[PDB]
Design a protein around this ligand. Structure first.
Ligand SMILES: [Zn+2]
Ligand SMILES: [Zn+2]
Ligand SMILES: [Zn+2]
Ligand SMILES: [Zn+2]
Lengths: 89, 89
DNA sequence: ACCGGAGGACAGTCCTCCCGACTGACTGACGTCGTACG
DNA sequence: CGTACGACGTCAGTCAGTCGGGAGGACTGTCCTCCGG
């Protein structure tokens, strides 16, 4: 049922046999069944919890930045830089 | 499929006919079919838009103020409280 | 080879709506008091 | 004066109705695998 890391990336049918499978035995390959990777729950209640948090921060930032491209700031990645910027408060 | 407003509110089978229906007609009430309520899409792309912007507003918030404040805002429902928070600077 | 997307089992929504519990109201029964008669 | 009967009032029990938890289930959209171009 779970396919192997590689068959997964290569997208071919997996034989699925453990410990090494079809191809991964053949091409003498590093065959892993990596564990099931978590996501946050897609439920309505959780969408809504997260939308309520986002609204409140969104509101708090309308007052910090009444003037624009908050989105400019939101895209930056550098900490010094962002902080150099803000010290134009 | 859609039940009338009153049957919905009361949770009894609706006849659903046109215009009115059995119990609004009988019981003497103004039977309505309200529009479905617009909600946000519960897709994964959309939960991720929203979790990942909330995260980045949290990251920026923390260059400006202490983490203990993050936690307060993330819970406030009152617009005076979100603003006062900011006023104690 | 490689990878866009078809295919499909599955996760979880989001409707209408049946069913059970709880509360209120109404009716009946009993008890107590008051009046009348011996 | 004392006893008995009737009437009224109060309490309990039963039934009905209504808010509610939530079952049922069609459906929306996920999130895998792996086809075939
Ligand atoms: Zn494999
Ligand atoms: Zn393998
Ligand atoms: Zn109806
Ligand atoms: Zn109706």
């Amino acid at each position: 049922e779970q396919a192997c890391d590689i068959c997964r990336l290569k997208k071919l049918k997996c034989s699925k046999e453990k410990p090494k499978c079809a191809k991964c035995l053949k091409n003498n390959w590093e065959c892993r069944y990596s564990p099931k990777t978590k996501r946050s729950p897609l439920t309505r209640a959780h969408l809504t919890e997260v939308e309520s948090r986002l609204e409140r921060l969104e509101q708090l930032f309308l007052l910090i930045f009444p003037r624009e491209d908050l989105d400019m700031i939101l895209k930056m990645d550098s900490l010094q830089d962002i902080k150099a910027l803000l010290t134009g408060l």
